[PDB]
Amino acid sequence: TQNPMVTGTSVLGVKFEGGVVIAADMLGSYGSLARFRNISRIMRVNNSTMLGASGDYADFQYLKQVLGQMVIDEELLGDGHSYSPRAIHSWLTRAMYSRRSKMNPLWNTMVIGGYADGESFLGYVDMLGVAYEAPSLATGYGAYLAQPLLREVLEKQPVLSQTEARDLVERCMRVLYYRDARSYNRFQIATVTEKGVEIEGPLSTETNWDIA
Amino acid sequence: SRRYDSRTTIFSPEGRLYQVEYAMEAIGHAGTCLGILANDGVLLAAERRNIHKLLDEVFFSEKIYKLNEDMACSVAGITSDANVLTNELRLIAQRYLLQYQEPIPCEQLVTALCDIKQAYTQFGGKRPFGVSLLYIGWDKHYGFQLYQSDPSGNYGGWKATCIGNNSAAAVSMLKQDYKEGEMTLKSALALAIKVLNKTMDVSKLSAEKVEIATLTRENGKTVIRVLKQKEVEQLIKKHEEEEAKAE
Amino acid sequence: NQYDNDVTVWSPQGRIHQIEYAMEAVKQGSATVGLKSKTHAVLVALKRAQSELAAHQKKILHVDNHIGISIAGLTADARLLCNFMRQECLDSRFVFDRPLPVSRLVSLIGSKTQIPTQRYGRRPYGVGLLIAGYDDMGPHIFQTCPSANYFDCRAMSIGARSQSARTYLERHMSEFMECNLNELVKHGLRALRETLPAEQDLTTKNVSIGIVGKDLEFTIYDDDDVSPFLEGL
Amino acid sequence: SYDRAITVFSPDGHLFQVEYAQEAVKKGSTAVGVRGRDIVVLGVEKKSVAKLQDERTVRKICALDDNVCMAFAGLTADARIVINRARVECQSHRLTVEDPVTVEYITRYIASLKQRYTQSNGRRPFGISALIVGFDFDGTPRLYQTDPSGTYHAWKANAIGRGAKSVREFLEKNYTDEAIETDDLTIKLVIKALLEVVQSGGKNIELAVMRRDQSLKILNPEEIEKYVAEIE
Amino acid sequence: RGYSFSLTTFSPSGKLVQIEYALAAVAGGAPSVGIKAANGVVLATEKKQKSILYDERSVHKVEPITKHIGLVYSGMGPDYRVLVHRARKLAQQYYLVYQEPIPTAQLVQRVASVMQEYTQSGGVRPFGVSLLICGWNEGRPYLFQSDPSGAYFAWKATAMGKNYVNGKTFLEKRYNEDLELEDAIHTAILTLKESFEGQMTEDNIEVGICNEAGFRRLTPTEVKDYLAA
Amino acid sequence: GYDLSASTFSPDGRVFQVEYAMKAVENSSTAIGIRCKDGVVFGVEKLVLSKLYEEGSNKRLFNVDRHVGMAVAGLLADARSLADIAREEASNFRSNFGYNIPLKHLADRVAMYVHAYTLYSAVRPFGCSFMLGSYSVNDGAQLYMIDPSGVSYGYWGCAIGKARQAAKTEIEKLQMKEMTCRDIVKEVAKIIYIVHDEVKDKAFELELSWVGELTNGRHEIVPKDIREEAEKYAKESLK
Amino acid sequence: RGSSAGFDRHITIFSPEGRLYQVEYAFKAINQGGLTSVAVRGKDCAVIVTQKKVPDKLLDSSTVTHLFKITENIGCVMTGMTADSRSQVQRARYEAANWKYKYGYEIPVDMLCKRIADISQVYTQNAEMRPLGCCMILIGIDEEQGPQVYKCDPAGYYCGFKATAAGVKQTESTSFLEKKVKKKFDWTFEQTVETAITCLSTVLSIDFKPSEIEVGVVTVENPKFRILTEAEIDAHLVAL
Amino acid sequence: DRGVNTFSPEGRLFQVEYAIEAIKLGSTAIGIQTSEGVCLAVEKRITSPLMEPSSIEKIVEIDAHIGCAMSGLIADAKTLIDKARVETQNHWFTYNETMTVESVTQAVSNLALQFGEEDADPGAMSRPFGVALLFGGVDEKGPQLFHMDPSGTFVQCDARAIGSASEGAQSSLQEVYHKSMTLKEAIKSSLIILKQVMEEKLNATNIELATVQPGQNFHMFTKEELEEVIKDI
């Protein structure tokens, strides 16, 4: 992709004890415009792996059909071996690096959470192929407006709970609503646990208070 | 599929190429054609195969197929297999004049086709061309030349040679009546008609069963002119009347 | 009579002679034995003597850290297929950063081995392989044959006079899972011993033993390293 | 593209197309050459002169380079492809190396080319054998012989074509340091060998001598008769 | 993948058997008789359907290449079609380069070259169809005959198909160089009458002419007018 | 020598290389399937040669997609390739058209892949017969069978293996149109054991699978609880 | 009679009489299916009728059919190897579709058969591939010419028909229906469905039931090809 | 009748089966692997006295530390020794190390059994190699002597004899060879067996020998150096 068209905004993430949770608002962006607000940028890959992405939404649908379909192909023969959250993160990092080598990159900026083998996995995949594993992740402007709040809580308390990390995500998402023009009120929260990935419905930031 | 392949490019137990040796016998039944190297020019005397009365004239000639302004050929073999050869010869000769801005030497154009005719006798598994065609022309170095190119891919220079039907009996006559360096143009036209008589089963020559083309130098320009019916009939009447005076 | 010259020509009995002649070459080879327990999978093979002064062979090649094979068949066709197996295992760790499941590696062999069988002008792979590997599902003995089909075995022996070894394996096949690492190899040794003439015995120089496991990667044992295993035989 | 194996193995380890390619060598004209001290000589035996031939283009002695030339026996067509492509290698080697080609270099290129078409798909081996002479940068004479199978060997004297078995036995007993000493006696050694394989009589042959200084100049039919008259 | 080895090879007698047997399919085909008159050329062929259910207005054995060129065949139906559609392509490739109506002799050499290519390149059999090609160029009539080997011959009048030997001798007697287009049509119909075995009608043959106005095939109404004489 | 190539017709207009290809299916153990109102039920008689083979080896039931199953009878080599090709046929469909492939379209794409190799001498026809089945809300259950010639017909039930006619007599009187999937699973095992020969082939392993509404359009191998119930019910009627 | 020499018995080339010894066996391969198709066109309509035989009770009647829809206004019926049948139909649907995308309008029946006849011709000229063992019958309504019924064969012969017969009974059904070439159009109108039914029922002496055959038609008022339901076929079968 | 890829009723792959028989028409080549070095001895088989013996190379330079002996058709092994020299330089180029003898013989043997007339490549080998190469040299593991069969099967050999006289020559190697012998005894023991298997008179002209020491590089003996060993035999 030489230039993006419909772009997404910051996608958060944090790992807690028992799973990983991320959140992303539902809005489309073309030339400083909110166009499609019904688009869901959080994808459920398979039972043990969950994914979310900022950036171009059109390139994300290509990653929906290419990556999601590989899950079926692995489940056709059914020998008991499934893709781990760090294996999909590795295959996806390889696919993102192969695109920039031909100078046809994908503008997507992605965050991959997952829970497997009793260990919560969280990973980052960018357009340029930069990949790593951090306890908390925020893309786009979330690195400026959110990750400082993420590292602040995780520095004093490295291990969180499911309810405490949820308040951490909802509080950082509300901060994204104030100072980011590409943000949006309604947002999806998906959580992977020992029972699998569960994508909750729309949640509103309307509890915010503006004092002028 | 190996079962359906006829193994054309293989070797015989005696060291022979089947499709090459069988293509030579197709030439032995092909149209009789000969040529004579003289001092001021070279000619091509070819016996016309189809004498049928309902046949018309199309362009300029029958078996000739002039390859260039400075040289021409004559073909004996499969009538179709000669056409693709003459087209490639006109391609090779003009690529030389395009590349080197010079008229093609007769020694070079013969070498080029004999490499293409050989290409099908070695690799590709195709059949070789069943046509052995002669060469006449003029260059800036050795002047007038006469060549014979066999389907095997080999060629050579000839002062007098014949191809087609009754070629063995025609070369034997050219070994005696021909004199090296002493043959002029008009003496060669009479020698060509003399060979076309004994080498053809017909009682005589009516001039519609033969075609003769001469190549001479006029004012520093090579001209190729096929003798018309009235010009060939004068040669036949000259040899038919002189034969009665020799007996 | 005329149906045996091509692999793409079916016989009147609905049979392909060319593929079966390739399965004759693996039975004219050297006897190779392998079996798995609930923990480790072991490959034990006879290294054939072409002469008295020659170091016999190496019939066990390294594919990946968690995967290993045993060669019965044409040797040059084995590494030609093994180089694809080595490239396939490196493909997973390169792209997926995970060990490739042994069941999926053998499925890629059946797809590649079949292509020469169905096309004219090509021959089936004339080498069988006993593949030992440790995946998340445990040890894997998965077998490959000149025919593209593969089989999942608890214990298997191929090569010359391998039927006498399969008779030994089928009798004791119930106790294989309860065997420890040291006693597990001894079953493959006695199974491979039945593949030898009465005038031949198992030495240290002619025997190579591959082993793959959970906490132990795939390693080959040379003539000096197979002495502790032959101490009880 | 036509891909098929023309040359395949046979019982008792034989190659039919390769062995039958050597049969065409024994069916061609006889070419004989020797290696002297400062001089090398090549010659061929023409089957029938007939006095209809143009003797220039029918020459079986070609020149691969200024210091390298060759004479063959076999199908005339299979030769011309070898001479033409070897002259390209002699010019391409002068491009990169900036030195004249060594006699063994072009011999290995021709031997490998005769080898390549034996094991290549849909390609027949050459039906010719080549006798290559030349002089290296130090001035040492060289005589090599290539076969349709692709093997090359150096020779003090060699004979190819029909009747080569009788000429090789003739050159074996008559080759010594005395006959290879004088430059004129070396030329007569080939002619004496050619007259044994020619059943017609006189000189129908064609012979070419390549020295060091002023390379090769082929001998005319009148100049070859002077040596035949001296050996009579 | 296709066969790269030539199916047509030289027989031990020095002949090409696949082309020689290709002439047998031409000799067993439907008779077609071309005649080259002074102001034009006529092509008359025998179009006979095995039953009355076949549609005579569906396919035309006489088909034009360009407006000024058309040709008819004696031989197999299908092997003519891929041959004649390429002749229509080779004719317009000339018109693209030279922006000029293609000469007849130039069109025959390109079609005969394609008929030769399948007698040499491997994996393909020769054509079993022979051509009678007409055209009007440079104020002169043209009549040619393309052999399955790829050889062409200029004919004033000729015939092929069933009983071509007895038919060809019938033309040489009644043919004249001073004949016009109207007189050459009747002589071409009389040759189709030489071997028929039945009662011929307007739908029992197909006839077409090439004059200075271009090439066109005669409608079944115009064919009946020429059958009354 | 008319039978030495698939591109050569016989004097009577038959291609033996295609006809000898389906004869290898007759040398393979019986595999059947039944299309009922609630879905499609599959079954296979899987003959294990040596007891050394692990249970589940040489799996005869392949899933070319999540809602489509596959059951093969013939050479096991040609069975796994056609399974992967049928996977690619369903793979390229969901990529381009974005929705699940109808089994009417899936069976037609694979049947032409099999027939494409019957027209040339450079390749050989497949020697295995395989069946397809699926379930959908709008399309319902569908069962097709592709022969080695590349032909695909619709079937309520089909029998391919050693005994073709023996199992068809049991399926025709079954009256599957009014029966649900759970009732067919017990009937399929009864048909596998009655066509089996206790003389020639001794050791065998029953392979069963279904697809239908109770899986919400999904094809999976039978759990051990249901499989044990159908095998015990089938042996009771065998006597 | 016909001489045979060389490879004529395997790859398609010239017989000593030039009969294409191998190509003639693709016509006999059509009779291997043991079926007969009868196609006839009227003034305003064209009708195709073929035999529908279910060998086993486990077959699905809706899935087994020899009538296929190439385009909206063009129908089809096949007689020959059913495996070769589906291959030629998919090529006809792909060829007719390239017409609309390239040339802008719906393809006539005239040139839909010739291109397929040219494709089947490629199988006859090349030795590496065998001709198709089936014949295609294509019908439709042309703008200028109206109803058209053509059939292409393994040899590539698409020449027109006033009525078309195929299969084992082709020889018997052609001569019987040839006597119906008598009166102009043989009472050509919507009931020409019975014209094809009585011709097919006469040669086989079957006296088909409503579901025993399958029928489809194209008309001027309804240019779209429709496959007649067994309930509609029973209306025409009960009238004869 | 049949193609280059076919399996025998015993699975012998006739093309290589007939290629091994072509080795039995070649000259005898003998070599010995000692602890102090390896040696390679081969018969030249002079056809005529006019043949220059200096132009017959049946022993060529693969790398500086590696050398190879050849047998059978001299031509067919010329393309294998050329790919070996390129393989040794490709390894020293990338890894900056002397290429081991194990990888040299394994890489060259990969060209064996790889051939076909169907879609192999733009260029292809119509037949396998009818030659047998004896590879030798000193690597990091010490002096090594290997063999390469037309079937692509390479075997580590202490002493092996190939060529027409290979039968009966290997029986002479097993008697006189032992692990403690030196290189000087290996050169002498080679010519003694050569004296038995050579038809003509054995002298410095018709014999070709070269050795590889661990300290030194590959070197071939001259005309004066061969005269000393012959007088000792």
Author numbering:
A (entry chain N): 1 to 212
B (entry chain C): 2 to 248
C (entry chain F): 4 to 236
D (entry chain D): 2 to 233
E (entry chain B): 3 to 231
F (entry chain G): 6 to 244
G (entry chain A): 3 to 242
H (entry chain E): 9 to 241
Task: Give the authors' words.
The proteasome, the primary protease for ubiquitin-dependent proteolysis in eukaryotes, is usually found as a mixture of 30S, 26S, and 20S complexes. The 26S proteasome holoenzyme consists of a 19S regulatory particle (RP; a.k.a. proteasome activator 700), which is responsible for recognizing the ubiquitin signal and unfolding the target protein, and a 20S core particle (CP), which hydrolyzes the unfolded polypeptide into short peptides of varying lengths. Three of the seven β subunits in each of the two β-rings that align this proteolytic chamber (β1, β2, and β5) are proteolytically active, and between them hydrolyze most substrate peptide bonds to generate a variety of short peptide products. We show that 20S proteasomes can degrade the ubiquitin tag along with the conjugated substrate.
In order to better understand how a ubiquitin conjugate enters the proteolytic chamber of the 20S complex, we performed cryo-EM single-particle analysis on purified human 20S proteasomes before and after incubation with MonoUb-Cyclin B1-NT. A similar analysis of substrate-incubated 20S complexes resulted in five classes, with one class (S1) comprising 29.1% of the particles in an asymmetric appearance. 62.9% of the particles appeared symmetric, closed at both α-rings similar to the 20S only structure, and could be refined into a map denoted as S2.
